[PDB]
């Protein structure tokens, strides 16, 4: 069937919608054989092992986001989470509709996503908007009382290791090195997936929930699993932000609590049936959504380029062609998996500390943005928190921010970021805290960077405008000695981020407080578009 069908009427605002539109619509042409079936049920018997709990309305109504969409239907985020008498009697007819009607289409919303990307004209043009689909709040809260914890639970008891959202950025490159170290001869690849959310068929999403219901479930979680596979997850009619009919879907979307889940298993599923088609010698895979990686032993320089276009082969008969070609990689640091590359440093004590780093020019890019107007979402804040240990973050990063968050004095001002795709409310003084936990205390002493991270930095600074790091140092100084003048935490934010920019560095002892931040909904599960929210506690 067609991944998309049209009517015509425009993907309306809240222009380049027409571009991705031609991209994701085609037909999908899937042959299954032995070895998907057979990773299928070792799948089934990982997922027969969970119990999954039915959420209350008021569990559900906790998890949605202030700024989630508002309904059609008379009610918003705030009514929501304040268990107003209106969207709480909607959300339990929505309930009660998924019970009984196992066979209506769900309308969903189309629209087009404002994203923030580099002005290139180097190497090709501007590319187009992506595409989010997502069905009305009284829906997306009944998604979380039936699959809330199918979706958190359910992907690493199937997948185990390979399930990429159980780490934190420090256990992602802990679990990169010791595959690449196990290896007689390591090889690694990372594959893109052309349009993988066009590519999943109504047979990948009835698989994902032939798995879903391995899980020991209450009747009625059982009978909505059931009802949001056909009405909802499926496909079904899309409406534009106007309200008019734009056309249909048979394929994943975008903005459903499943996305995240249901692409990871599904990319897990073809992947590794894809690798014995292949017959790539002792896999290892990294799965995160449509993110793939596999490091394996290799089997010669000629054999490994064959065995890459057996894979790829495979993946095209299972609906999953590649967007680029596979490469073969004979370095860890060389494979970019979730944009990001391994790259080492040195901690005070001259010891070698491997951590997650990117190329910057879209963290700056944003941030930029973010800087210059208004803007829900702080991904600043959330490239503080995921790449801590890294030269760009800590030298440019903070000490953009902190110098702003001083001037307007709002240090402790919550703000909120994605944490993959969840929605987490952090206030900057609790960084510290948050980056010893996360990345370990010699994230605040690394040194040593490498010659190749030092020089992508320092070239995307020129690119962009952006002062030279000799000039950011300068303003550490000032930055560091005002907070250490506040005292408490403002005073932790000043010594343990900004230790680097100081001619004689201190010691630096463990954040005693660190320890009472409840992380534990923290590197769980992947969220995106799932419509995900947590208040950062203790
Ligand atoms: O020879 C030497 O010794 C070096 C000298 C030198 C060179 C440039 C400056 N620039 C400045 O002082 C000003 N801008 C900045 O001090 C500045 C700060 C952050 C900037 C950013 C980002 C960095 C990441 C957080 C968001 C802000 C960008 N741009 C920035 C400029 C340059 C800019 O204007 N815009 C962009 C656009 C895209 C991406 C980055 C940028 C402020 C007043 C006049 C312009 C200062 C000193």
């Not at 998309?4 to 042959?31: E, H, M, N």
């Not at 190329?359 to 973010?370: S, V």
């Not at 510290?432 to 930095?457: D, T």
Request: glycine fraction near 6%.
């Amino acid at each position: 069937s067609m991944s998309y069908t049209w009517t015509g009427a425009l993907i309306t605002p809240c222009r380049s919608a027409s571009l991705r539109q031609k991209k994701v619509t085609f037909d999908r042409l899937q042959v299954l054989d032995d070895h998907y079936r057979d990773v299928l049920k070792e799948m089934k018997a990982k997922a027969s092992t969970v119990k999954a709990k039915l959420l209350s309305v008021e569990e559900a109504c906790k998890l949605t986001p202030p700024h989630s969409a508002r309904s059609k239907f008379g009610y918003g985020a705030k009514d929501v989470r304040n268990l107003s008498s209106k969207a709480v009697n909607h959300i339990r007819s929505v309930w009660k509709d998924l019970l009984e009607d196992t066979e209506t289409p769900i309308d969903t919303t189309i629209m087009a996503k404002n994203e923030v990307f580099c002005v290139q004209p180097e190497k090709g043009g501007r590319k187009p908007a992506r595409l989010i689909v997502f069905p009305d709040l009284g829906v997306r809260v009944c998604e979380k009382m039936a699959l809330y914890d199918v979706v958190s639970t359910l992907p690493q008891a199937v997948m185990g290791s390979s399930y990429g959202f159980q780490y934190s950025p420090g256990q992602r490159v802990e679990f990169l090195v010791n595959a690449w170290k196990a290896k007689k001869c390591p090889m690694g690849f990372a594959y893109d997936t052309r349009c993988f959310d066009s590519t999943v068929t109504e047979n990948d999403i009835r698989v994902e929930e032939s798995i879903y219901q391995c899980c020991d479930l209450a009747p009625e979680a059982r009978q909505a699993i059931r009802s949001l596979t056909e009405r909802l997850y499926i496909g079904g009619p899309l409406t534009n932000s106007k309200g008019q009919n734009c056309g249909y879907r048979r394929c994943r979307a975008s903005g459903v609590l499943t996305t995240s889940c249901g692409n990871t298993l599904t990319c897990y599923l073809k992947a590794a049936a894809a690798c014995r088609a292949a017959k790539l010698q002792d896999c290892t895979m990294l799965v995160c959504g449509d993110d793939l990686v596999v490091i394996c032993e290799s089997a010669g320089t000629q054999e490994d380029e064959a065995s890459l276009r057996a894979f790829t082969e495979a993946m095209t008969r299972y609906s999953a062609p590649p967007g680029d070609p596979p490469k073969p990689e004979y370095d860890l640091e060389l494979i970019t998996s979730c944009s990001s590359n391994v790259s080492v440093a040195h901690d005070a004590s001259g010891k070698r500390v491997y951590y997650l780093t990117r190329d910057p020019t879209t963290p700056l890019a944003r941030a930029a943005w973010e800087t210059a107007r208004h803007t829900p979402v702080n991904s600043w804040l959330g490239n503080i928190i995921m790449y801590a240990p890294t030269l760009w973050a800590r030298m440019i990063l903070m000490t953009h921010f902190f110098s702003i968050l001083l001037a307007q004095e709002q240090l402790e001002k919550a703000l909120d970021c994605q944490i993959y795709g969840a929605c987490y409310s952090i206030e900057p003084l609790d960084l510290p805290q948050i980056i010893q936990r996360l990345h370990g205390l010699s994230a605040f002493s690394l040194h040593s960077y490498s010659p190749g991270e030092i020089n992508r930095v320092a070239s995307c600074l020129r690119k962009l405008g952006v002062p030279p790091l000799r000039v950011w140092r300068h303003r550490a100084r000032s930055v560091r000695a005002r907070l250490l003048s506040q005292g408490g935490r403002a005073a932790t934010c000043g010594k343990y981020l900004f230790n680097w920019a100081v001619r004689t560095k201190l010691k630096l002892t463990p954040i005693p407080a660190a320890s009472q931040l409840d992380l534990s909904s923290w590197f769980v599960a992947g969220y995106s578009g799932g419509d995900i929210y947590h208040s950062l506690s203790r």
